[PDB]
């Protein structure tokens, strides 16, 4: 619309200039200082300059009013706020620095730019890129059956911020699932287990159908929290300071064998197997507690006329 | 012959993408899931895939359309039967 009118005005100006140049193709000889129209010319120039300055001042006042309202500070202001509220940003073009966990996780490598966008209630809307979907573990034991081998048919405030958090969560979940899979496949013959692309189940003893499973959009909560905390504590330990003086850069348990002779203690205090085995033996403890409770209930129901045995758990 | 030719093209296309995605997911299982458990495979330039089992009773499995039967989906083959 306005582009055509602007082009027509520019063409008219160019034609006028070309005609003037052709007529010319300022010159004294050798053989607006009027003080009447110069006044009006200076007045018009001052008016135009005042109008331009007023427009610039209006733009500056609008910018200052937009900066005053701390609700739409998308002009690299809320961006700095989130930068101080989130991880670093190795800016290639505008923003990078995903939850790569290359300093806190130390797991399946996944790094790169994740969210660099500045556009628009009026949030910047950081793009969540790339699982981009919920994924969590679900566990229960109700009429378990070892017979399996079927498909994975599941029986199941800032918005971009929690979206990015859930993205980091599902990323670390995928990482730990890959880790547990590598452990189950590279382990010795301590116990057999079943490993599928997304569903895992072991059998350390009869009637142990541990129903831990990686879900995704494509007891019942405590054990998964325990597993997550143990794996993240493992990673944290993989990252205490070594207290280095010359160049230990290790753990004090290594140097403790020098003064304090440890035939097998130092071997046991160095590192051990964990992950699937610890969760498995935790489930074993759980089923043992269940069997003890069942024995107590059976004694109460059957040996009722008998002396009523009384138990009390520890703390 | 639009019907037969279009069917041929779409069929070879889907089988090619299927074998490619199979190869890629097996390579992913090698890199991520199974280090050397099933890290044995040998296939041609295309239209055929084959892999082996753990080494020391070693067997092998294979899948290929073989371009002989237009209705044969995968033709899963393996020397020791069930």
């Amino acid at each position: 619309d306005s582009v055509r009118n602007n082009l027509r005005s520019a063409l008219t100006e160019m034609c006028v200039l070309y005609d003037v140049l052709s007529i010319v193709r300022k010159k004294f000889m050798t053989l607006s200082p009027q003080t009447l129209q110069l006044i009006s010319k200076k007045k018009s120039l001052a008016g135009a300059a005042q109008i331009l300055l007023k427009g610039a001042e209006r733009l500056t006042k609008s910018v200052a009013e937009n900066q005053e309202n701390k609700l739409q500070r998308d002009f690299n202001s809320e961006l700095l706020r989130l930068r101080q509220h989130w991880k670093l940003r190795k800016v290639g073009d505008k923003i990078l620095g995903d939850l790569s966990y290359r300093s806190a996780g130390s797991l399946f490598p996944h790094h790169g730019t994740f969210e660099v966008i500045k556009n628009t209630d009026l949030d910047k809307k950081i793009p969540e890129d790339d699982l981009e979907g919920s994924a969590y573990i679900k566990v229960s034991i109700q009429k378990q059956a070892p017979d399996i081998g079927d498909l994975g048919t599941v029986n199941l405030s800032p918005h971009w911020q929690t979206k990015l958090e859930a993205a980091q969560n599902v990323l670390l979940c995928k990482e730990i699932f890959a880790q547990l899979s590598r452990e189950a496949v590279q382990i010795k013959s301590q116990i057999p287990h079943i490993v599928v692309k997304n569903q895992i189940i072991s059998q350390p003893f009869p009637s142990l159908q541990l129903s831990i499973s990686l879900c995704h959009s494509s007891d019942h909560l405590y054990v998964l929290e325990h597993n997550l905390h143990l794996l993240i504590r493992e990673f944290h330990k993989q990252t205490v300071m070594p207290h280095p003086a010359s160049a230990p850069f290790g753990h004090k348990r290594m140097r403790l064998s020098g003064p304090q002779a440890f035939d097998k203690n130092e071997i046991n205090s160095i590192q051990s197997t964990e992950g699937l085995l610890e969760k498995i033996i935790k489930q074993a403890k759980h089923i043992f507690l269940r069997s003890r409770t069942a024995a107590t209930i059976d004694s109460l129901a059957s040996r009722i006329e008998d002396p009523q045995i009384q138990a009390h758990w520890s703390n | 012959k639009p019907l037969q030719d279009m069917y041929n093209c779409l069929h070879c296309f889907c089988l090619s993408l299927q074998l490619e995605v199979l190869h890629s997911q097996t390579l992913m299982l090698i890199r991520e899931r199974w280090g050397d458990l099933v890290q044995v495979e040998r296939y041609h330039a295309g239209k055929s895939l084959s892999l082996s089992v753990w080494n020391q009773s070693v067997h092998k499995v294979t899948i290929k359309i073989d371009e002989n039967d237009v209705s044969k989906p995968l033709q899963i083959f393996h020397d020791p039967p069930l």
Binding site: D129 | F13, L17, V21, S24
Partner: peptide, 23 residues
Amino acid sequence: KEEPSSIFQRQRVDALLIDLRQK
């Protein structure tokens, strides 16, 4: 998401070869 860094870097070549064979 339209990056060819995925298997499309090779899937496209496979498609091209398959079509050149069929034509």
